[PDB]
Amino acid sequence: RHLFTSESVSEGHPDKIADQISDAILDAMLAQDPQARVAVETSVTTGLVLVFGEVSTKAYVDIQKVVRDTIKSIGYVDGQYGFDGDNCAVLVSLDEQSIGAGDQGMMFGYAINETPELMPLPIALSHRLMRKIAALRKDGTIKWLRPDAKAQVTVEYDEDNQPKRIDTVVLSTQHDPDVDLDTIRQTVIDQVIKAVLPADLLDDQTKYLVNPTGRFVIGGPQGDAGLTGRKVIVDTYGGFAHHGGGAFSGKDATKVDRSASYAARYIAKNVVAAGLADQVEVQLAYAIGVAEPVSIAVDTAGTGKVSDEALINAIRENFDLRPAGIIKMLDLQRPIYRQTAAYGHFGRTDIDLPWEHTDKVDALKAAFK
Amino acid sequence: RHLFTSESVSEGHPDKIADQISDAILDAMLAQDPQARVAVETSVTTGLVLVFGEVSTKAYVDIQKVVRDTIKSIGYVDGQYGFDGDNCAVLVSLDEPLDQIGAGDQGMMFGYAINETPELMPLPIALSHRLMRKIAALRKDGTIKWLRPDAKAQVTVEYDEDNQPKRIDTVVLSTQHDPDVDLDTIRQTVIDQVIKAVLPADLLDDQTKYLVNPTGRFVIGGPQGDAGLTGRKVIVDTYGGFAHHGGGAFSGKDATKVDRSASYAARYIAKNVVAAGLADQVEVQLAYAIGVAEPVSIAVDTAGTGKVSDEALINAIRENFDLRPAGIIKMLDLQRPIYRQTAAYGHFGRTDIDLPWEHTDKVDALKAAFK
Amino acid sequence: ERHLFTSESVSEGHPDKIADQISDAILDAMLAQDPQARVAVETSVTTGLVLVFGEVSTKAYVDIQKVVRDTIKSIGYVDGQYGFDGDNCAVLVSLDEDQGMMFGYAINETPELMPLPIALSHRLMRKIAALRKDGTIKWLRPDAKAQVTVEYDEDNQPKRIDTVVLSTQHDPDVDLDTIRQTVIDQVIKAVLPADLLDDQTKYLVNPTGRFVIGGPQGDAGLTGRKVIVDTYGGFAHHGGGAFSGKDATKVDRSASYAARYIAKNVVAAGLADQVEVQLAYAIGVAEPVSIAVDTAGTGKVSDEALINAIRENFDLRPAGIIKMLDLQRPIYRQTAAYGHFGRTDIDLPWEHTDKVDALKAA
Amino acid sequence: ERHLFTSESVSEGHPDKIADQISDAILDAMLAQDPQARVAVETSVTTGLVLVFGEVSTKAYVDIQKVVRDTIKSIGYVDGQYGFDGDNCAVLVSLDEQSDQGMMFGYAINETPELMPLPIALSHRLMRKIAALRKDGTIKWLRPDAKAQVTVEYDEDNQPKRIDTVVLSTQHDPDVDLDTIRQTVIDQVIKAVLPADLLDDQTKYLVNPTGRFVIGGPQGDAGLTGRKVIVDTYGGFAHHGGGAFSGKDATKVDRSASYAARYIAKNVVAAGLADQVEVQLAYAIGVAEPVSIAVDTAGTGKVSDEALINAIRENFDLRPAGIIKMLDLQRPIYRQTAAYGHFGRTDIDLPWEHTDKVDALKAA
Ligand SMILES: Nc1ncnc2c1ncn2[C@@H]1O[C@H](COP(=O)(O)OP(=O)(O)NP(=O)(O)O)[C@@H](O)[C@H]1O
Ligand SMILES: Nc1ncnc2c1ncn2[C@@H]1O[C@H](COP(=O)(O)OP(=O)(O)NP(=O)(O)O)[C@@H](O)[C@H]1O
Ligand SMILES: [K+]
Ligand SMILES: [K+]
Ligand SMILES: [K+]
Ligand SMILES: [Mg+2]
Ligand SMILES: [Mg+2]
Ligand SMILES: [Mg+2]
Ligand SMILES: [Mg+2]
Ligand SMILES: [Mg+2]
Ligand SMILES: [Mg+2]
Ligand SMILES: [Mg+2]
Ligand SMILES: [Mg+2]
């Protein structure tokens, strides 16, 4: 029985709090200094936010205000949650310091026509569940919802490895303590899960598990811990793709780890959007102090409507893949990163990310003329 | 040109300092309480070690002593380096059949093995690990007294049309050193006593690029200029990006965490399959459901190197491995202090230490399943 | 020119007192299992944070996190609406493994033989706290402060009470007029002696106004930054140690307790109306090398003769003081708020007047 | 019975003084750009750690990390030798952004030219000398952390009769034996600073009686802002309202009125209106002027107490705002006070140590 599970987490999850803080600080600095170099880790545990890293910028930023404001947007805005943007400890250890690649790295991109956003079905549905739960909290539709939430979607795959059905949805949400489990369960199933899962993939055997922990009143960093870059699979493709092993949040586009991974997605997505494959993993190899990627591999899983060598050729001709090139190409020296630090860097329908534009379709179509 | 790069890092790298501390605390507790539940993150920056997490144990452990002792073994001792086990800040924020123990995460875990190396690991990650382990051994036995703990290796292997390892294209190796040694000496010494001591001669040619400390001088390192966190070397810890990920991290977690135990089990499978000659390579894929001991689903990718059916191989695995969380713990004897040693130079492919999930003692069981 | 003198006291809830009580709660925890425990434990508290740091040497097993969080809960920080909570705040722990002057003071201004300003300040903070904790006033929150200005006559006798300033943390659902009338009636008028009050006595309750979030939230607190509050409200001189976080091995603490024990017994015996006792220790000499005494000419006896009675009736060696006052017991958390001296509400050995007959007889 | 009195001072290197200097270095940094800067900055220091925390409200842009690490380097913790280092130690920062019915006491006494009690003054002079000798490189084996305790013997009339005991403990490189440490401190520090006319063959000199002392600063110990208040003031000769100075801008009457109280005491005694005086200021909530001024001359008054209080009300602006203008306190002048005493300073120029109100008081 071919079953595959992917997870996503809300803005409220401690690991995502860390990622959003790291990227909020990045935005704050790019907002004043497009040239800002940034390398900012965040750690969060019971009542604590430690920010630490190197930075090099002309920008003047009140880190405390950025951290506390980020935590408030997420929804931690009164002490009944245990965690509060105004009342939590914030400790800061920042150093201040004011082409060609710096890492001998591998970066991977992926796309697949399983969903309109060209993402695998499990990660895409997980993301849509966390984004819906969050929207329902924030617009005030469900007043008892608290920030921290998690979804795991198990999809059952065919003989052809096509998505046959949805086997299990696990969804856990933080809530006000004045709401009983039966209400939380019925409400999530009805207004979150059944609002987002396509009806044609559900049957009477689909398992819906809401808050299997039971009550979940105190959350965020309170019982738990959270760190920058511990939701890499959530951040990318839910484990459909390979990894060079950087993490994104807290890093400016100077970091090819981040910029080439965005570029790799841009390629994969345009290839599949153009119909040149049903799925493709793009593999970029950089050498230290060589701008151009030293090597480009491509895996279509034999869904390629074109040669592998011919596809690699189209990509070398229509994408600038030098670190500097990618920055100009995707316009990455702008404060666009806080919004990526929850609900996935890839497959985003709710916000406009440059590497999700399908504006290289005509360029690629034309390359076979 | 089909090129593929993997990195490994020394005990001295800040991310690995974090991983070793988290797992040193785990060992300390298992050493007194095999039943110890542990979830311990570590963060390290300039002169600082923050330890934080949940724990539940009958053990009495001096966390400060464990952290400072771990940092000293790594080699940060007697105040030379700017990071020191005796002199650094340490802050601690700690909270306080075999069927019916089912899984807690609705997770995916992956295992991998490939006959590219005797340890049955991909060539890039394996060589990277061997370089960091050699540099470390040479420091610690005192063969090269000017070496400092923090070091990094990136090995680029060139693959032919059939994706077989053709040659070694580039080795990048950066090491921390005493400031009284010039770059030319560092470079010639690393090339001769580390790289040429470890890279198989038959994969080297006059076009192999050796870049040692391409940044230049590297005197202050560890957490000093940098930052390090538990579970930010997951690719280093596993298969150098040859395999897929459910997205746990290992260090700081007791074997109660199926994220860790099933990943160990998945390697044990993959390695025994390939060791038995039932494939040249296999990725093993385990799917667990919340509160179901048995994996709900097992997939297997041989890349058409399978000497046996996929359905028949999955069958042999279900018959010869206990894959219940509790089962894996008994099977691999995981309630022992065996984890500090995994937190640098890879969890997989280890020839220098004895890890249960690296034993090839299920070969005859699997061979026998096809006669 | 009006001879006015002001002293302040602060509640368990004040951030500096939170620090002092945590440091001393950890000390008690260890003495409770190991009377020989050596302890030197500083605490710092700011927005949502408690850093504990210091040296310790003990056979005791103590969960520091549990001690810190339990201390903070007793103080009354027990739900997140206060901003500060024993369950939800950050707790960081950094625990490793004198040629001095000390001063004592006593004065017959109050039955406890303390200066009137510090004594009244302490009684106000102790009453406000009792009223919160027994649930008499449900809208009170932990953090509170009192400043009592006493007017002194010619002869420097307490003539009247000029001003009482009292500021308390409260639930936000209670109006200022209610807070003021309630504190005046159930705290101030319950504690200030009527014979020292007149129609000119100024009562200022929460002159800042509303005060809903407090403790370490807006502020900062450190171990040993309420030394004047802890002692005699500025009537006395200081060698300049602080008490909380230190076992009785620290002569800074033990000799200061001993100095009070002397002063109090001298004045209780009627040998003076007031006395400051001054103890000088030399490094590696058990006995104090020198004892001075200032009666402010209220001495019923010679200074040299009084010093003589003290040398004859008190063991003043560090070891001696520990045995004499039985100081290797967990009795210190109690002292870390509402004053080390003049305590009628708890039993401290250095407040016993059991050496009166010994000094009368001399 | 022998009337003996001991005061201590500590070096820049002592952990409590490291905390005080960091808190005041941050204050200076902000006043340097914003004279109007409101500041309330605590520092804590333990093994390899500096936590900075407090409220602040300023137009100034300050790299706190750079200020902390630079302060620690001046103190002498500079090249990874000592186990505490300005470049290698942890620095954590928790600063919030916002852009008293008190007693304060002053004291002066003609026991020393600076008009300070002899014990605290001599203690300060020993720590300042030990520090100068380290920093100018005269004694290369000295390390930052050091402590002095001076016991003075007093007469029946409480006049300084002699110096009974000097205790001085210094941190040192481990390659130097105790006999060298002792002879060097006695010769180049103690005998360089103690007035010969107060020494006799009974004067006890104890140098490093503890023994070896190679690791110090915050390493084995802990240090906090405002735990050297007696050292910072008058060595226990005076009374205390119970503020601490370092980390606080002059907006804090705790600090500004204490400076003002010293300014008064010193000018009174400098004018010869008394041999010693303790000045006592009482402030009431919402009254700029001190509500009450007491004065204790210990019967050394050459004038009435009521007449002296009158001269003080007529010649000093004692309103919080008044004191700031009077002593020009909205300037970066505070880092220098955070070691070797706020009062009696001969080596630096502090406004509250000027004796420029003598003629005003003489004339009254
Ligand atoms: N001047 C230098 N020259 C060379 N190497 C250095 C220098 N300074 C630091 N390093 C090393 O480079 C490391 C950073 O590499 P890396 O492993 O990428 O860091 P990371 O903090 O784990 N981030 P990332 O891999 O991008 O997700 C440091 O931890 C040191 O090991
Ligand atoms: N004490 C708790 N009570 C209730 N729910 C909790 C508690 N602790 C954790 N959780 C929930 O479980 C989540 C942690 O699970 P997970 O997403 O695996 O995070 P992680 O362990 O921080 N990261 P990783 O190891 O990289 O997979 C929390 O964010 C909550 O959703
Ligand atoms: K966690
Ligand atoms: K880093
Ligand atoms: K101290
Ligand atoms: Mg985590
Ligand atoms: Mg990287
Ligand atoms: Mg890192
Ligand atoms: Mg998980
Ligand atoms: Mg304070
Ligand atoms: Mg002292
Ligand atoms: Mg101390
Ligand atoms: Mg005050």
Q: Would you list the DSSP string of D269-280?
A: HHTTS-SEEEEE
Can you tell me the distance from the alpha carbon of C249 to that of C39, in angstroms, rounded to the nearest whole number?
9
Is residue A54 part of the annotated active site? The answer reads yes
Residue D56's CB is within 10 A of a number of other CB atoms, namely: 22
Contacts of residue D65 in chain A, CB cutoff 8 Å? Answer: 93-96
Q: Which fold has domain B15-95?
A: GMP Synthetase; Chain A, domain 3 (3.30.300)
Atom of ligand 2 at shortest distance to CA of A230?
26
* B96: helix, strand or coil: coil
Contact A221, A17 (CB under 8 A): yes
Residue contact A89–C47, C-beta within 8 A: yes
Is residue C250 part of the annotated active site? The answer reads yes
Can you tell me the distance from the alpha carbon of B79 to that of B65, in angstroms, rounded to the nearest whole number?
17
* Structure token digits, residue B355: 């890890």
DSSP H stretches of helix in chain D: 15-31, 64-75, 118-135, 178-185, 229-232, 253-270, 305-315, 320-327, 358-363
Contacts of residue A91 in chain D, CB cutoff 8 Å? Answer: 51, 92-94
Atom of ligand 1 at shortest distance to CA of B228?
21
Q: Which residue has the tokens 């003769």?
A: C305
Residues having C-beta closer than 5 Å to ion ligand 3? A 224-225
Nearest CA-CA partner of B113 in B284, B236, B246, B241:
B284
Can you tell me the distance from the alpha carbon of A245 to that of A230, in angstroms, rounded to the nearest whole number?
11
Sequence-distant (6+) residues with CB within 8 A of D213 are D145, D169, D170, D171, D172
Can you tell me the distance from the alpha carbon of A151 to that of A172, in angstroms, rounded to the nearest whole number?
7
Q: In the β-sheet with A163-175, what is the strand arrangement from edge to edge?
A: A2-9, A145-157, A163-175, A207-210
Buried b (16+ CB within 10 A) or exposed e, A314-346: bbeeebebbbebbbebbebbebbbbbbbbbbbb
- Give the Å distance between the CA of B15 and the centre of ligand 4: 9
Sequence-distant (6+) residues with CB within 8 A of C98 are C251, C252, C281, C283
- Give the Å distance between the CA of D15 and the centre of ligand 12: 8
Straight-line distance from the first to the last Cα atom of chain A, in angstroms, rounded to the nearest whole number: 43
Ligand nearest to the Cα of A222, by number: 2
Residue A215's CB is within 10 A of a number of other CB atoms, namely: 13
Nearest CA-CA partner of C188 in C124, C144, C122:
C124
Contacts of residue C54 in chain D, CB cutoff 8 Å? Answer: 46, 222
Residue contact A247–B227, C-beta within 8 A: no
Q: Which residue has the tokens 């303790």?
A: D278
**Amino acid identity at B198:** V
* Structure token digits, residue A118: 């060209």
Which technique was used to obtain these atomic coordinates? X-ray
Max distance between CA atoms of chain B, in angstroms, equals 65
Ligand nearest to the Cα of B176, by number: 1
Nearest CA-CA partner of D102 in D309, D296, D258, D276:
D258
Q: How far is CA B84 from the centre of its chain?
A: 24
By C-alpha distance, the chain B residue nearest A301 is B303
Straight-line distance from the first to the last Cα atom of chain C, in angstroms, rounded to the nearest whole number: 42
Which residues does chain B break after (C to N > 2.5 Å)?
Answer: 96
Can you tell me the distance from the alpha carbon of D235 to that of D243, in angstroms, rounded to the nearest whole number?
16
Residue contact D83–B86, C-beta within 8 A: yes
Ligand 2 near A216 CB (within 6 A): yes
**Amino acid identity at D332:** P
Sequence-distant (6+) residues with CB within 8 A of A323 are A99, A100, A101, A253, A254, A256, A259, A260, A291
Nearest CA-CA partner of C31 in C253, C333, C325:
C333
Can you tell me the distance from the alpha carbon of D353 to that of D337, in angstroms, rounded to the nearest whole number?
12
Angle at A149 between CA A148 and CA A151, to 5 degrees: 160
Q: How far is CA B329 from the centre of its chain?
A: 19
Give the closest residue (by CA) to ligand 2 atom 19: A15
**Amino acid identity at C300:** K
DSSP string, B273-284: HHHTTS-SEEEE
Q: Is B304 left (phi over 0), alpha (psi -120 to 50) or beta?
A: left
Sign of the dihedral through C-alpha D272, D273, D275, D279: negative
- Give the Å distance between the CA of B16 and the centre of ligand 8: 10
> Count of A–D CB contacts within 8 Å?
27
By C-alpha distance, the chain A residue nearest C81 is A79
Nearest CA-CA partner of D258 in D241, D270, D237:
D241
Ligand 1 neighbours (beta carbon < 6 A)? A 246-247, 257; B 13-15, 150, 152, 174, 215, 218, 221, 225-227, 232
Q: Which residue has the tokens 């880092």?
A: D335
Give the H/E segment covering residue A226. Answer: strand A226-227
Atom of ligand 2 at shortest distance to CA of B105?
18
Can you tell me the distance from the alpha carbon of A271 to that of D138, in angstroms, rounded to the nearest whole number?
74
* B54: helix, strand or coil: strand
Contact A57, A36 (CB under 8 A): yes
Contact B257, B285 (CB under 8 A): no
Give the closest residue (by CA) to ligand 1 atom 28: B226
Nearest CA-CA partner of A187 in A197, A176, A195:
A195
Q: Output the CA–CA distances (angstroms, integers) from residue A162 to A117, A151, A166, in the order listed.
A: 17, 22, 12
Contact C140, C169 (CB under 8 A): yes
Give the closest residue (by CA) to ligand 1 atom 7: B218
Contacts of residue C92 in chain B, CB cutoff 8 Å? Answer: 50, 91-93
- Give the Å distance between the CA of A113 and the centre of ligand 9: 27
C226 assigned ligand-binding residue: yes
Can you tell me the distance from the alpha carbon of A190 to that of A160, in angstroms, rounded to the nearest whole number?
31
- Give the Å distance between the CA of C88 and the centre of ligand 4: 29
Sequence-distant (6+) residues with CB within 8 A of C324 are C258, C314, C315, C349
* A309: helix, strand or coil: helix
* Structure token digits, residue D228: 């050297």
Max distance between CA atoms of chain A, in angstroms, equals 65
Helix, strand, coil share (%) of chain C residues, nearest 5: 35, 25, 45
Does domain D16-96 correspond to CATH entry 3.30.300.10?
Answer: yes
Residue contact C49–A48, C-beta within 8 A: yes
Can you tell me the distance from the alpha carbon of C350 to that of B263, in angstroms, rounded to the nearest whole number?
64
Q: Length of chain D in residues, anyone? A: 364
User: What is the least distance, in Å, from the CA of B346 to any CA of chain D?
Assistant: 29
List the resolution, Å: 2.8
Query: What is residue B352's DSSP assignment?
Result: S
Alpha-carbon radius of gyration of chain B: 21
Sequence-distant (6+) residues with CB within 8 A of C358 are C265, C313
Q: Which residue has the tokens 């993301």?
A: A127
Sign of the dihedral through C-alpha B243, B248, B253, B257: negative
Contact A364, A270 (CB under 8 A): yes
Is residue D305 part of the annotated active site? The answer reads no
Ligand nearest to the Cα of D230, by number: 11
